[PDB]
Amino acid sequence: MLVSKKNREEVYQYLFKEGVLVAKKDPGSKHPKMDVQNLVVIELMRGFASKGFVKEQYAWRHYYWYLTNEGIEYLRQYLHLPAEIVPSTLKK
Amino acid sequence: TRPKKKKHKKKKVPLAVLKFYKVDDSGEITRTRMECPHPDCGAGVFMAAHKDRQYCGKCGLTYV
Amino acid sequence: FTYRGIELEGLLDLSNEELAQILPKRARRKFSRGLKRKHMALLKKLRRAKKDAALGEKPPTIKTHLRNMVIIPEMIGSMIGVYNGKIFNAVEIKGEMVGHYLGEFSITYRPVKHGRPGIGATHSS
Amino acid sequence: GNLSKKRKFVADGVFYAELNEFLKRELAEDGYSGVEVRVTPQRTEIIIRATRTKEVLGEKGRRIRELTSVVQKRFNFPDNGVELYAERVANRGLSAIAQAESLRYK
Amino acid sequence: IHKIRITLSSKNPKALEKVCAELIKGAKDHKLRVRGPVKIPTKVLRITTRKSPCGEGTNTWDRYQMRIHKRLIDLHSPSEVVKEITSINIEPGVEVEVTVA
Amino acid sequence: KDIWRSHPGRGRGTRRCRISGNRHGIIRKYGLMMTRREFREIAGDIGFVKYN
Amino acid sequence: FKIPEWFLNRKKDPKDGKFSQSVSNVVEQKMRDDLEKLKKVRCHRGLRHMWGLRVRGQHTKTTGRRGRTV
Amino acid sequence: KKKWSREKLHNAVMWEKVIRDKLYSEVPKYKVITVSVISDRLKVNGSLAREALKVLHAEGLIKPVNVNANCRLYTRAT
RNA sequence: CACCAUGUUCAA
RNA sequence: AUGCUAGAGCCAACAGCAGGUCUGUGAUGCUCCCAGAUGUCCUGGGCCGCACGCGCACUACAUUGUCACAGUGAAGGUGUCGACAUGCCCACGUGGGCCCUGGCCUGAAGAGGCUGGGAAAUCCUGCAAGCCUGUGACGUACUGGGGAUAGAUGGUUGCAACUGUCUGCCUUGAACGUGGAAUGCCUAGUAUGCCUGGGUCAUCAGCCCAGACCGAUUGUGUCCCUGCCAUUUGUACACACCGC
RNA sequence: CAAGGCGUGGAGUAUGCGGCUUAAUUUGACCAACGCGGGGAAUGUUACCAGGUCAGGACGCAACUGGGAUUGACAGAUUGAG
């Protein structure tokens, strides 16, 4: 996929902060709340979903991705995050 | 049908940082290629020793 | 040569803001719009080729897709291979081509010379 | 302002239609029957009506908070602008959709 | 006592008349010099698509319509009084907007 | 290489259905941006009714 | 005679640059000149003229039929 | 192309002595006077017929009855 | 009570 | 107020057609391609290309008319990123503009500038629609009918106008003189005529979907033609008479 | 159909279809196809043709490989093409 390390890190920071991620199907844009291209977000979430760290839905023109337990564990391991922090989905 | 265009692959030049610095036990390390001057940190980056140019790549800048 | 009562001397020693007024409506609007990078690049390349082949021959054939482009006095005498979509037809740019585009001198279809109508050309078949 | 009345109401309809389509793809294994949208001050409430609220809500509201977040971030809602709710469909036999998906999964 | 315009609009005449009657009842509960529901001509949004997903058959046409009903109410009331009578919960689908000058 | 999706214009190649993503026969009448094929599936949920 | 210039028949006349009202067979003489100028160079419009086709972009599929059933 | 399926009228374009004096003499005694009746009775242009109707009505040898875009009815004065 | 002949092979 | 089901429509059962659509879909099974791609993007071209046959529509063949001036005088509607703009431009690290446009000014027009309104029963807009009516010119002549074709060249939309997007101005002035065999639609605010709005649309409407306006001739039946429904009847048909 | 009205068939164009030409003139459809695919395509639309890019080949396995797997690029050529 050949994503820059800072793009990987930003997408993972967002996906872990909010336990969910949304991405328009349009690949040639950049989506808000990120400086990362929608194409890069989609090509990363294909990998996460195939590894099983993300549940993927596609309704009209949008992808909705939901973190899994394996996904929060892997993102902890990757972003080096303490067990103190859990996604905003788990905050309550 | 015409021939196929090759995909460009890097030359795989081994150990370039060695030919970068000439080390002197008499004095100390001499750097063969000039560094590149920029407000963005290019003090460690080197320009290419082109026959007619000096070309910094991290910035994309060329002397003649 | 007398294009609009202005020989090549005046036409080349002119202004593009005055080419605007000597050219027709569509070229004038295309110039009012500030013609683009690829057109300026092709003009630069034509200067290159005319300086490359100067006295004892004709300039080399410069290949372009720019059928969009107007012909101007600065372009007179050059050999431009205009694209159809299949081949680069070489075009020696004369003086009576000014204002027109390059797509008017590169043709995109082979003239139609018909054959036998064959089945289904009527209602008797 | 910012929108005609014609365009505001047609856009409300398109918004409801996208909501419904997403939700019927997302909650099909769970008895999703319908959705109501109530634009109220302080909150655009969205009431999901499903057969099995026990599983339209996740492990400790996990799934419904997922859906709330993802709707916020899809439709660009001002934070604290939408709240999703589930409620058992009163009959489950008067819902063609809820029975169509039942027969589907059988 | 300040001039107020409550504009209501809906794709549901039943749910619109319910809320307009509710607001008139509230504005007369402590009479606020109400001028009753001015009925703006209903907006018919007509969309006439072709039935078939492919160009085969007699060209038929589905004629859909969306009727948008709009009712005005005029008051001479204080801000929080009118916002109270408005905040008594409004039916779904009805879009209510208040203007003061 | 940043000529990838750099077609300069805007038109019936950028107007894609908000559901299908298909550019053929879209209904952009009220900002609807549907395609005439998906509108006949969605209409009742938008609020359009077939009266006459 | 105070007839304005936007009223005239040749309004800029390439090869001359002058504005004149071509009249009484200099009309088709100038038409022949303008077709000669456009057929000397291989301008598409001059080519259409010389092949006897419909210049200025019509559809020559079913309209310029001109008899000749086959 | 295959085709699947009136001698000309030479009407005087300008007046002459005989036809003009005949217009003066005879026509003001017609029951119905119209562009067409004048043109057929004198073999004269329709515009000359309109001119004649106007002149004769002006200087009194004919009175209008129903003048309009369609048939311009005049009649003999008395 | 003018005249009104015909419809390739398997498949349904 | 009225009396074909009041008019007009919407919805419309059961069985089917091997009717159309896999090119509407993140509808889809099997199958093919899959990096020198049948993915995708970009440039150019093509889809429009013309010895011909056809469907269909627009314009006509003129005086119940064409042009010129003027008058009277609709209805449905649409309209300013809530996907685009996460852009481009003017202005000044930031505002305004992008849709429908009024009024004023420049120009012969096309059109362009200045300045305002409208997220609209509020502004465009009482859309001062065309047909129509009044007058004048034309005078039966392929004609001031017809306006196809073509020439020089001024705007506009657009990143881009060549194979002319549309459009201004002068010029050019074709066939067509009511159309063979044949054939379509139609029963009252209907046919026809005449324009208007919306869809498509950055620009292109001779198209479609609707809207009014002017407004009838005939018929109020029949089963002759072409077919439909029902009963009776015959049959060697059942893929069902395009049968055997 | 009868009584009839407006016509269509003849003319010129607009457009769809067949045919022919073409690098390609993408293509479906033949009462119930032919201003129909809301298909009025300058370009993206596009499916067709001449070229040229990019991978947007997940995930797994093996190989290579921080005594560098790979990426991006100035300039001169090349290219239609900064």
Residues 4-43 of chain F with CB under 7 A from strand J are 4-12, 14-15, 17-22, 24-31, 33, 35, 37-38, 41
Q: Is the dihedral of CA D81, D84, D90, D93 positive or negative?
A: positive
Q: Which residues make Cβ contacts (< 8 Å) with residue A47, sequence separation at least 6?
A: A1
Q: What is the DSSP string of H50-68?
A: HHHHHHHHHTTSEEEEE-S
State the Cα–Cα distance between residues C80 and F5, nearest whole angstrom.
Answer: 29
Place of tokens 């402590």: E30
Question: What is the C-alpha separation between H38 and A32, in angstroms, rounded?
Answer: 88
Q: Which helix (H) or strand (E) holds D25?
A: helix D5-26
Let me know: does C23 contact C98? Beta carbons within 8 Å: yes
- CA B32 → C1' J86, Å? 46
Angle formed at CA C33 by CA C27 and CA C34, multiple of 5 degrees: 95
CA distance F14 to F24: 11
What does the alpha-carbon distance between residue A67 and residue D103 come to, in Å, rounded to a whole number? 30
Is residue B42 exposed (0-12), middle (13-18) or buried (19+ Cβ within 10 Å)? Answer: middle
Token pair for B43: 């003090």
Size of chain B in residues: 64
Helix (H) or strand (E) holding D55: helix D53-56
| Residue whose structure tokens are 């040569």 | C1
Overall resolution, Å: 3.2
Long-range contacts of residues A48-53, Cβ cutoff 8 Å, at least 24 apart: A48/A15
3-state secondary structure E56-96: CCCCCEEEEEEEEEEEEEEEEECHHHHHHHHHCCCCCCCEE
> Percentages helix, strand, coil for chain D, rounded to the nearest 5?
50, 25, 25
Count Cβ atoms within 10 A of the Cβ of residue C25 and give its class: 0-12 exposed, 13-18 middle, 19 or more buried: exposed
Q: Report angle CA D83, D85, D90 to the nearest 5 degrees.
A: 155
Q: For residues C46 and C34, give the distance between their C-alpha atoms in angstroms, rounded to a whole number.
A: 19
CB contact (8 A) between residue A57 and residue D62: no
Characterize the bridge pairing of strands D43-50 and D82-88.
parallel
The Cα–Cα gap between D98 and F12 comes to 39
CA distance D33 to E7: 33
Residues for chain G: how many in total? 70
d(CA H76, CA H56): 10
CA gap C37, H2 in Å, rounded: 58
The span from the CA of E37 to the CA of F23, in Å, is 44
Token representation of residue C97: 């081509």
Collapse the DSSP code of D2 into the 3-class scheme (helix H, G, I; strand E, B; otherwise coil) and give the result.
coil
Half-sphere exposure of A16 (CA within 13 A, CB side): 23
Cβ atoms A14, A87 nearer than 8 A: no
Rg (CA), chain B: 16
User: In whole angstroms, what is the distance from residue E65 CA to residue B39 CA?
Assistant: 64
Q: Are C64 and C56 in contact (CB under 8 A)?
A: no
- Kindly give, in sequence order, each residue whose CB lies less than 8 Å from that of residue A50, ignoring residues fewer than 6 positions away: none
D24 CB-contact burial (10 Å; exposed 0-12 / middle 13-18 / buried 19+): middle
Gap between the Cα atoms of B22 and B2, Å rounded: 47
Q: 């002149």: which residue's tokens?
A: H55
Strand order in the sheet with D82-88: D32-40, D43-50, D82-88
Task: Give chain J positions with protein CB within 7 A.
Answer: 8-11, 19-21, 24-26, 36, 41-55, 64-65, 76-86, 108-109, 119-121, 134-142, 149-165, 168-172, 175-180, 198-203, 208-210
DSSP C11: H
Nearest to F45 by CA among D11, E61, D101, D87: D11
Give the up-direction half-sphere exposure of residue H7: CA atoms within 13 A in the CB hemisphere.
1
**Radius of gyration (Cα) for chain F, nearest Å?**
15
Distance (Å, rounded) from C-alpha D21 to C-alpha D33? 11
Any atom of strand J under 7 A from CB of G25?
no
Method by which the coordinates were obtained: cryo-EM
Give the CA G21 to C1' J114 distance in Å. 38
Helix and strand totals (H; E) in chain H: 3, 2
Strands (DSSP E) found in C2-44: none
Please give the DSSP secondary-structure letter assigned to residue H13: S
User: If you ran DSSP here, which 8-state letter would residue C30 be given?
Assistant: H
Distance CA C43, CA H69 (A): 67
Of H67, H23, H29, H76, nearest to H45 by C-alpha is H23
The terminus-to-terminus CA distance of chain C in angstroms comes to 58
CA distance A38 to A45: 10
DSSP code for G20 = B
| Cα–Cα separations (whole angstroms), residue C29 to C17, C21, C68, C76, G44 | 11, 10, 13, 21, 22
User: Chain F contacts of A25, Cβ < 8 Å?
Assistant: 21
CB C50 within 8 A of CB C78: yes
SS (H, E, C) E14-35: HHHHHHHHHHHHHHHHCCCCCE
Count of alpha carbons within 13 Å of A91, Cβ hemisphere only?
Answer: 10
Task: Cite the DSSP H helix spans in chain G.
Answer: 26-40, 44-51
Give the C-alpha separation, H43 to H10, whole Å.
Answer: 7
Distance separating the N- and C-terminal Cα atoms of chain A: 35
User: Would you call D41 and E87 a contact, using CB atoms and an 8 Å cutoff?
Assistant: yes
Which segments of F1-52 does DSSP mark as H helices, in order?
36-46
Using the 8-state DSSP alphabet, how is residue C104 labeled? T
